[PDB]
């Protein structure tokens, strides 16, 4: 019993969008979704943020798989990760959008680059803790491979403690699928 909201980076840098969708797919199909099971909402961000669908638009695990594979990349001349997370926190995770009172809030952030708005990331993360939201962050290192160090510390600072059981690291958009297993069986 836990409402899951995936915060997808859809900026110009993300490529190809096919592997990102293959990731959602391979992850969302292993879940039992329902009003009394586990709900999932997806938010995409770039220069701006947009709700793909709310936590309770779909009550079936299959209805979620079809809608998911229907998500289009919106692009973006910036990677406003802070804006994306903060928007999921105070907009997605709200009763109005399907958040279930009492249930555990879980946020999944996937990005491939340092955010342009990293100056409000600290504040945004702290507000996620204050609302007790478990955070799992996934960093795609493609574009950097340039040290990925500072990039890594930023994405980690997004995941909840302990970092080791919340933060993931993949070589590129293709390697995203090699996480679904560990990712899921760690959200239990």
């Amino acid at each position: 019993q836990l409402d899951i909201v995936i915060v997808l980076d859809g900026s110009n840098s993300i490529y190809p969008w096919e592997s990102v969708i293959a990731f959602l797919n391979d992850l969302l199909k292993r879940m039992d979704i329902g009003p009394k099971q586990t709900q999932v909402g997806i938010v995409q961000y770039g220069e701006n943020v947009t709700h793909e669908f709310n936590l309770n638009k779909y009550s079936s695990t299959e209805e979620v798989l079809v809608a998911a594979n229907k998500i289009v990349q919106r692009g973006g001349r910036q990677t406003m990760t802070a804006l994306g997370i903060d928007t999921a926190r105070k907009e997605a995770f709200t009763e109005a959008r399907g958040a279930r009172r009492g249930v555990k809030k879980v946020m999944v952030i996937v990005t491939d680059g340092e955010s342009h708005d990293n100056y409000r990331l600290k504040q945004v993360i702290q507000d996620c803790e204050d609302e007790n939201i478990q955070r799992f962050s996934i960093a795609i290192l493609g574009h950097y491979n340039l040290s990925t160090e500072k990039f890594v510390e930023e994405i980690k600072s997004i995941a909840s403690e302990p970092t080791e059981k919340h933060f993931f690291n993949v070589s590129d958009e293709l390697a995203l699928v090699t996480i679904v297993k560990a990712l899921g069986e760690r959200i239990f």
Epitope: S13, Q73, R74, G75, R77, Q78, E114, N118, Y119
Partner: T-cell receptor
């Protein structure tokens, strides 16, 4: 929207002099970029991610800054550094350049 | 080595149309977001349009509705279709490769 103002608009210095160009943004940005342009030629990538030198850029060049103030510094002005230097930001739309600093060499 | 080469410039009358093209080489073109930057005579640089590797396009106000940026990955070429040209559009147009979300102009022709 973010506007960049470079200062000085132009400057004159002697070889060996330590020169520092400034770029102030109308709103904070977390990175700045610079390009060098010589008369009649395409701009050249000079400094990116605030302080990384593009391949081929001699070691006397460096970049620094944060918030709304970023700089480009030449530790020992050489005669070959005369040019117009442009700062540029990718944090606000539309992406924009500073009006540039034209640097000349004394003799 | 990585390289870009602009083409299509010339004299055109006010109200006329003109199509610019840019051939890229030395890198995996389709994976990069590309842009066009212009410089009017005796003035500064001005970003004009951008297209991501995903096909998403963005524009500078003064040209949106008149210029159209496109790309053809089978030929590793970038295009800029310019309509309703005005005297203020006079300038040297540069094809340019972007880094990250495209805002850092990595390569210039």
């Amino acid at each position: 929207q973010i506007q960049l103002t470079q200062s000085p608009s132009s400057l004159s210095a002697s070889v060996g002099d330590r020169v520092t160009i400034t770029c102030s943004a109308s709103s904070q940005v977390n990175h700045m970029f610079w390009y060098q342009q010589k008369p009649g030629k395409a701009p050249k990538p000079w400094i990116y991610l605030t302080s990384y030198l593009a391949s081929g850029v001699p070691s006397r060049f460096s970049g620094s800054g944060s918030g709304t103030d970023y700089t480009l510094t030449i530790s020992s002005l050489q005669p070959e550094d005369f040019a117009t230097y442009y700062c540029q930001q990718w944090s606000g739309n539309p992406w924009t350049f500073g009006q540039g600093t034209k640097v000349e060499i004394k003799r | 080595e990585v390289q870009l080469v602009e083409s299509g410039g010339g004299l055109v009358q006010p109200g006329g149309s003109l199509r610019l093209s840019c051939a890229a080489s030395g890198f995996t073109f389709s994976r990069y977001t590309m842009s066009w930057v212009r410089q009017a005579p005796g003035k500064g640089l001005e970003w004009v349009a951008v297209i991501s590797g995903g096909g998403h396009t963005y524009y500078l106000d003064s040209v949106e509705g008149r210029f159209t940026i496109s790309r053809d990955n089978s030929k590793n070429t970038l295009y800029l279709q310019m309509n309703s040209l005005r005297a203020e559009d006079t300038a040297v147009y540069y094809c340019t490769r972007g880094f990250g979300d495209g805002g850092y102009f990595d390569v210039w022709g």
